[PDB]
C-alpha cells in the first residue's frame, strides 16, 4: 500500500493518535524500543520451517521450498551443502521469511 | 502417513502409524 | 550426526498430529452446536408461524 | 570457512532449537492459523484461471 | 560429480542401504543433499 | 544437556 516515507508518517500519526499519549501527569512513560533481530536468516531450520509451511500451504509446495533450501553453494573451488539456514538469493525467499517473521511476531 | 498428509488446519484423519516393535 | 535430529523430527510429526487431531475434534464440536442452534431456529420459525396463524383466525 | 564450519557444526551439535521450543512455535503457529480461520494454499489447478497472469 | 566420480556405487542397494535411507528420510524431510553423505549415495540416487 | 549454540 505505502512507501517507506508513508509509512513513517504513519507511524507518527499513529503516535500521535495514541489515548493520553503526551500526558505524564501520573507518572506514566512511552517507551520506543527499535531493534533488530539477530541472525535469522542463518538460524532458520529446515524441517521446522517444512512445517509451518505445511500449515500453510500444500505440501509439495512446501517440500519444494524446503527441498530448494537444501542446495550446494559454490564460489570457484569452493563449496558445501546449505543444510542449515534460508538462502535470501531464492524467488520466494521474502514470501518464505515473511511467514517466518510473523511466526517471530508471535512469539 | 506423516508425508502425503495435507494441512493440519484442514481436519481430517491421521493416517495409522502401524509402527509396532 | 546428532540424535537430537531424531528426537527432533519426531516431536515435530506428534505435535503435527496431535493439532490435526484437536482441529477434527473442534470442528465436531462447533458442527453439533451449528445443528443445536439450527434446530432452536427452526422451533423459534415455528412458533412464530403459529403465532401468525393464530393471529389471522383471530383476525378472521 | 565460516560458513562451512558453521554448517558442520549444525550437524555435529544437533538442531540447536530444542524439540520443546519447536513444538511451543509450531503450536503458536497453529491456534494463531485457526483462530484467523485461515484456508491453506492449494497447489495450482490445471485449469486456475490465472495462471497466465 | 553425479556419475564420474569413481567414488559413486551404482551397484545395487543393499537391505541395511535401504534401511538407512528410508530412516534418514523420515528424520530429515526432503533434504537430499543433507541425506546423501550419510547414506553414501548421490543425493539423486538416494531420492530415485 | 543444554545445548551450546555455535557462536557460543
Known amino acids: 500500500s505505502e512507501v517507506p516515507p508513508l509509512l513513517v508518517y504513519k507511524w507518527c500519526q499513529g503516535i500521535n493518535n495514541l489515548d493520553k499519549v503526551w500526558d505524564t501527569s501520573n507518572?506514566?512513560?512511552n517507551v520506543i524500543?527499535?531493534?533488530?533481530?539477530?541472525?535469522?536468516?542463518?538460524?532458520?531450520?529446515?524441517?521446522?520451517?517444512?512445517?509451518?509451511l505445511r500449515l500453510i500451504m500444500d505440501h509439495n509446495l512446501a517440500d519444494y521450498i524446503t527441498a530448494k533450501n537444501n542446495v550446494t553453494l559454490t564460489y570457484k573451488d569452493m563449496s558445501h551443502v546449505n543444510?542449515?539456514?534460508?538462502?535470501?538469493?531464492?524467488?520466494?525467499?521474502?514470501?518464505?521469511?515473511?511467514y517466518y517473521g510473523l511466526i517471530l511476531d508471535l512469539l | 502417513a506423516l508425508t502425503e498428509t495435507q494441512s493440519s488446519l484442514l481436519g481430517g484423519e491421521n493416517a495409522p502409524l502401524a509402527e509396532g516393535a | 550426526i546428532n540424535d537430537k535430529f531424531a528426537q527432533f523430527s519426531e516431536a515435530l510429526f506428534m505435535a503435527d498430529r496431535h493439532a490435526r487431531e484437536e482441529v477434527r475434534q473442534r470442528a465436531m464440536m462447533q458442527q453439533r452446536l451449528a445443528e443445536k442452534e439450527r434446530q432452536q431456529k427452526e422451533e423459534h420459525l415455528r412458533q412464530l408461524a403459529q403465532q401468525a396463524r393464530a393471529e389471522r383466525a383471530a383476525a378472521a | 570457512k565460516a560458513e562451512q564450519e558453521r554448517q558442520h557444526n549444525h550437524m555435529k551439535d544437533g538442531p540447536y532449537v530444542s524439540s520443546e521450543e519447536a513444538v511451543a512455535i509450531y503450536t503458536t503457529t497453529v491456534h494463531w492459523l485457526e483462530a484467523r480461520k485461515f484456508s491453506p494454499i492449494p497447489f495450482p489447478s490445471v485449469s486456475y484461471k490465472h495462471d497466465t497472469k | 560429480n553425479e556419475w564420474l566420480d569413481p567414488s559413486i556405487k551404482k551397484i545395487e542397494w543393499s537391505r541395511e542401504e535401504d534401511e538407512k535411507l528410508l530412516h534418514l528420510a523420515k528424520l530429515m524431510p526432503t533434504?537430499?543433499?543433507?541425506?546423501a553423505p550419510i547414506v553414501g549415495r548421490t543425493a539423486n540416487q538416494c531420492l530415485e | 544437556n543444554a545445548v551450546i549454540l555455535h557462536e557460543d
Open chain 5, 31 to 35: 533434504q537430499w543433499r543433507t541425506i
Open chain 1, 27 to 29: 507518572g506514566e512513560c
Open chain 1, 33 to 52: 524500543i527499535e531493534t533488530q533481530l539477530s541472525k535469522v536468516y542463518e538460524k532458520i531450520e529446515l524441517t521446522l520451517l517444512n512445517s509451518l
Open chain 1, 83 to 98: 543444510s542449515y539456514g534460508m538462502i535470501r538469493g531464492l524467488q520466494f525467499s521474502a514470501f518464505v521469511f515473511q
